[PDB]
């Protein structure tokens, strides 16, 4: 489960990479956001705490999603 969960959280960092995103025209807001739950994320893995992974994946994973699809 661990593992599982580091998987899925480097995929969405990288698909959250701002400079591939810059087609999407985001918000400094979400900028930011995404900024701050890649830090999160990081450092979430680097202790394995599992609880701030799961919050940093379904965060990444909202985001993901909101900015890929209709408003």
Request: aromatic content about 6%.
């Amino acid at each position: 489960q661990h593992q599982a969960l580091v998987d899925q959280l480097h995929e969405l960092i990288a698909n959250t990479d701002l400079n591939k995103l810059s087609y999407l025209n985001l918000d400094a807001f979400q900028k930011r956001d995404i900024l701050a739950a890649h830090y999160i994320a990081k450092s979430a893995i680097r202790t394995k705490n599992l609880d701030q992974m799961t919050k940093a994946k379904q965060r990444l994973e909202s985001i993901y999603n909101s900015i890929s699809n209709p408003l």
